[PDB]
Amino acid sequence: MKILITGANGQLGREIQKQLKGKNVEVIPTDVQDLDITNVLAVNKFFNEKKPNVVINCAAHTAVDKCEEQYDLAYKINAIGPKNLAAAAYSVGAEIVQISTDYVFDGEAKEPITEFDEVNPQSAYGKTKLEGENFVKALNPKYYIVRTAWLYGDGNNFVKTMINLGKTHDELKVVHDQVGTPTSTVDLARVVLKVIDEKNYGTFHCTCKGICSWYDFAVEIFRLTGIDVKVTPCTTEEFPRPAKRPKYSVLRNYMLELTTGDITREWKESLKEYIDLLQM
Amino acid sequence: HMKILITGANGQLGREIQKQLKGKNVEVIPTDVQDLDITNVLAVNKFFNEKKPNVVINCAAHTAVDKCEEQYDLAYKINAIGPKNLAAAAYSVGAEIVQISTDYVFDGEAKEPITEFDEVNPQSAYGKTKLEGENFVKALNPKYYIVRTAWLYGDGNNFVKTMINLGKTHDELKVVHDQVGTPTSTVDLARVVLKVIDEKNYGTFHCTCKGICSWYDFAVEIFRLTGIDVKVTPCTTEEFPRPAKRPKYSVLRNYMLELTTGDITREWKESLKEYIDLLQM
Amino acid sequence: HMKILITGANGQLGREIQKQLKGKNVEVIPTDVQDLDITNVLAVNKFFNEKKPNVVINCAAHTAVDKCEEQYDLAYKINAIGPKNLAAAAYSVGAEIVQISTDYVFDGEAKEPITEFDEVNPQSAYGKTKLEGENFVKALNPKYYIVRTAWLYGDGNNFVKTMINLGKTHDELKVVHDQVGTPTSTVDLARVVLKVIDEKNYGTFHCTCKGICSWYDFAVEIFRLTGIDVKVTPCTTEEFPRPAKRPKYSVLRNYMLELTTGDITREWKESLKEYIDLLQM
Ligand SMILES: NC(=O)C1=CN([C@@H]2O[C@H](COP(=O)(O)OP(=O)(O)OC[C@H]3O[C@@H](n4cnc5c(N)ncnc54)[C@H](O)[C@@H]3O)[C@@H](O)[C@H]2O)C=CC1
Ligand SMILES: NC(=O)C1=CN([C@@H]2O[C@H](COP(=O)(O)OP(=O)(O)OC[C@H]3O[C@@H](n4cnc5c(N)ncnc54)[C@H](O)[C@@H]3O)[C@@H](O)[C@H]2O)C=CC1
Ligand SMILES: NC(=O)C1=CN([C@@H]2O[C@H](COP(=O)(O)OP(=O)(O)OC[C@H]3O[C@@H](n4cnc5c(N)ncnc54)[C@H](O)[C@@H]3O)[C@@H](O)[C@H]2O)C=CC1
């Protein structure tokens, strides 16, 4: 089995490579310098020559505020990229996994969101990622769309940010009026490889179990590291940004629950495992 | 030569399809839950990979409408995940899929016969879960047929048998007159399913019998045809409330059939008479 | 060699595609209704199974916009069922499908150039039936190209020829100035169609010429180019009412071209001048 990973140097790309080490698979990791997924001719040629069995697309323009000003570039990476990969995959009979986002929803939900709830993106990042999902489904029947959120792993992320700020500050203000679930790439990668394995095609939410605010997330980070910093809960209005962020983006892993099982862990368990890895 | 898997094959429609395929040049593989549980992805994949059917017709459903409201997870598993599993597994072996669906995808606020190009707006768990099943089938397999039906009777429990049993044990009955649709025989539905497969006339089709009436009118005609002496009284929906919202108006126009190879269904009274005659053998 | 079936091949675009494919290394099979009626499923299936094209380009449509309002069944057959039939028949033989569509899928209430990611909301029979055609094509064949165009002129009847004739027989004309879009030559549309096929750049594309004007501005430029002495007066839509709702604002941005392999269309006045020059040979 030949697996192409795009955006392979990112957080999730790295964790998938790691979980696939020693398995009976040939992994082809690419990032932008090896394969620019926005270029249709390049993508078609690559797939026709390499003939992967699966493509996992971890490439994205994830700077959320920058997407508002770089709408064209967001569409190219977040939407056209997936379109190109899905079709090129189809031409060689390959499956596609497309990683997506909780920003497809408007944030006005009051309870955990399922895969059957209606999308309504209020941001360029959300809109462009959604159009990426729509292309993937339209162009390749052998699709998996895996939506995630608040993702941390081998790369820049909120955990590393908090740690670095916390070491240089005596107090921090962190939003308490935005809720979701911190997710480790370890859990997301396990799920990605699980549905591939089962051929459990479709759209899946995949965040860790539980719920909290960014404030709660920060407090647990500092509890776990021992860093002495006073965190103060604040509101979204106090520190405004170019992109609209959802008040409530808790995803229910419903499709996993209804099929072969929600194997993700409680968010604090995954986070402890990650902090341990870092302090090593 | 042609190999046809039927899921939910012991149900009303499943039985009628088996019957209409007897003696045809096809290998039929009837399954119900104890042979193939369609909610189980691994079991479904393995079954398709080994049997390699050319067509799957999915007649399995969680049709207890009121019970779906209290069993939402189970309704999703049977009414949506099942179809998903069958559509993908079919796609993996190059098979076509027929997915039977429902008028409950609509909100019941229509004022004239509803076409396949009208907008869906399910107000029930049953309708919502059946709709998501349609969505999956189309997303996962380009060789699809979605056939929506309603008020279905045949070889199984149904309104006709219920009315007959009540009517024999009661001097009068109240039946809703403010809900309208069209009584449909599995005979007509099954002829249509097999017709579109035969033509490779892919897409979404409405398939109810011709004409229009209320459940009250349906009951009155049942008792006229059986000779059962029972006074039926028309009533309203508010008088006898249920857990699931039921459409006021769920008349489906068989527009895609009309626009393509012909609406071969019969007027509802004709199909019903043929059914009652079969019963009183 | 590559085999390209063209349906509606005698129409404006069908003729231009044939012309741009002359001398290329492709076998072109032009058909119009008398050779292949696309609304007939059995005929369409048989044709594809025998000819096995690699690509179908569908240029056939019921484009009489006002007449669609009174011929809704026929519009559905040609504008939706035809594409459905072609998309599925193509799929069965591994063929790609290009489906030509319309700015009438939008409601006309936009205030800036409309992209392929904007929401559809047809207010006419023509628009609604063409939209359903799009939906079928994408559902039934993953190797699809939907190319939306507007205000199209070429080798057939069109606004350019109409204006020229009226202008020769009239001293003044009233032309609507409150409906805006962009005049589009089949030369540019055909180049785009053949470009995306060549690239395997699947998806939905807008393809009108660059720029923006009203029908009034279009007329004024036509008469400037031909030298015809006629006074054109700008008017409103309310002054001269028609059965079909027309969009106030139907400027399509060719955004998918811009974001992918390039918007090769020309400025509308350049395309139009080339066309008028061809006409006055
Ligand atoms: N980061 C988060 O909190 C969330 C992430 N996601 C999604 O999860 C997935 C993984 O995110 P991370 O691993 O954190 O992303 P990351 O930002 O750590 O890495 C993304 C990779 O994509 C690459 N890329 C950019 N343009 C490319 C192109 N033209 N061709 C090929 N590669 C290109 C980047 O160079 C980078 O290596 C993405 O699809 C993202 O949208 C969704 C919701 C939240
Ligand atoms: N009966 C009616 O008035 C209406 C029926 N329909 C649709 O018509 C279709 C056929 O209806 P009927 O033949 O009357 O249904 P039925 O209730 O007579 O039979 C359905 C079958 O589903 C089977 N089933 C349940 N779970 C299963 C599983 N996990 N795996 C395999 N089989 C399973 C049952 O065992 C049963 O044999 C269904 O899709 C239903 O949604 C739609 C609207 C109304
Ligand atoms: N005319 C315009 O301003 C615009 C055109 N379009 C679209 O552009 C495309 C091309 O339009 P034109 O080239 O102007 O069309 P045209 O009207 O010049 O030619 C259309 C063709 O449809 C054929 N046709 C009708 N029924 C058929 C059937 N059953 N089977 C096979 N062929 C059949 C006709 O005989 C004719 O050759 C169409 O898809 C149309 O909807 C969209 C927006 C605007």
PDB file of C-alpha atoms in Angstrom, chain A residues 38 40-41 44 71-72 75-76 79-80 83-84 87 90-91 127 131 135 138-141, chain C residues 91 117-118 138 141-144 199-205 253 255-256 258-261:
ATOM      1  CA  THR A  38      -2.410  24.126  -6.176  1.00  0.00           C
ATOM      2  CA  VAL A  40      -3.148  20.937 -11.477  1.00  0.00           C
ATOM      3  CA  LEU A  41      -0.649  19.803 -14.087  1.00  0.00           C
ATOM      4  CA  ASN A  44      -1.861  15.063 -12.304  1.00  0.00           C
ATOM      5  CA  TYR A  71      -8.549  35.156   0.192  1.00  0.00           C
ATOM      6  CA  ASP A  72      -7.201  34.058  -3.219  1.00  0.00           C
ATOM      7  CA  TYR A  75      -8.904  29.400  -1.920  1.00  0.00           C
ATOM      8  CA  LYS A  76      -5.924  28.023  -3.813  1.00  0.00           C
ATOM      9  CA  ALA A  79     -10.022  24.496  -1.839  1.00  0.00           C
ATOM     10  CA  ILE A  80      -8.177  24.043  -5.195  1.00  0.00           C
ATOM     11  CA  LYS A  83      -9.948  19.539  -5.785  1.00  0.00           C
ATOM     12  CA  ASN A  84      -6.714  18.732  -7.601  1.00  0.00           C
ATOM     13  CA  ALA A  87      -9.534  14.222  -9.055  1.00  0.00           C
ATOM     14  CA  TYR A  90      -9.817   9.353  -8.791  1.00  0.00           C
ATOM     15  CA  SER A  91      -7.912   8.985 -12.063  1.00  0.00           C
ATOM     16  CA  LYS A 127     -15.305  29.116   3.763  1.00  0.00           C
ATOM     17  CA  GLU A 131     -15.272  24.500  -0.481  1.00  0.00           C
ATOM     18  CA  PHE A 135     -14.764  19.488  -4.153  1.00  0.00           C
ATOM     19  CA  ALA A 138     -17.788  15.735  -5.838  1.00  0.00           C
ATOM     20  CA  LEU A 139     -14.682  14.432  -7.495  1.00  0.00           C
ATOM     21  CA  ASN A 140     -13.913  11.206  -5.667  1.00  0.00           C
ATOM     22  CA  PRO A 141     -16.475   8.693  -4.204  1.00  0.00           C
TER      23      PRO A 141
ATOM     24  CA  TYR C  91     -19.695   7.362 -16.627  1.00  0.00           C
ATOM     25  CA  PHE C 117     -18.424  29.746  -4.689  1.00  0.00           C
ATOM     26  CA  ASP C 118     -21.408  32.066  -4.384  1.00  0.00           C
ATOM     27  CA  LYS C 138     -21.943  16.226 -10.707  1.00  0.00           C
ATOM     28  CA  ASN C 141     -20.012  11.490 -13.051  1.00  0.00           C
ATOM     29  CA  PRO C 142     -16.872  12.495 -11.011  1.00  0.00           C
ATOM     30  CA  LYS C 143     -15.055  13.516 -14.258  1.00  0.00           C
ATOM     31  CA  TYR C 144     -17.152  16.624 -14.796  1.00  0.00           C
ATOM     32  CA  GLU C 199      -5.618  20.090 -18.383  1.00  0.00           C
ATOM     33  CA  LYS C 200      -8.121  17.727 -16.714  1.00  0.00           C
ATOM     34  CA  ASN C 201      -9.024  20.798 -14.622  1.00  0.00           C
ATOM     35  CA  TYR C 202     -12.339  19.418 -13.365  1.00  0.00           C
ATOM     36  CA  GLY C 203     -14.970  21.390 -11.557  1.00  0.00           C
ATOM     37  CA  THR C 204     -17.252  24.326 -12.028  1.00  0.00           C
ATOM     38  CA  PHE C 205     -16.063  27.377 -13.981  1.00  0.00           C
ATOM     39  CA  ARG C 253     -16.189  36.545 -12.262  1.00  0.00           C
ATOM     40  CA  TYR C 255     -12.527  33.150 -10.511  1.00  0.00           C
ATOM     41  CA  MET C 256     -11.698  29.473 -10.958  1.00  0.00           C
ATOM     42  CA  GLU C 258      -7.901  33.056 -12.222  1.00  0.00           C
ATOM     43  CA  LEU C 259      -7.138  30.722  -9.314  1.00  0.00           C
ATOM     44  CA  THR C 260      -5.971  27.830 -11.541  1.00  0.00           C
ATOM     45  CA  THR C 261      -4.534  27.948 -15.078  1.00  0.00           C
TER      46      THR C 261
END
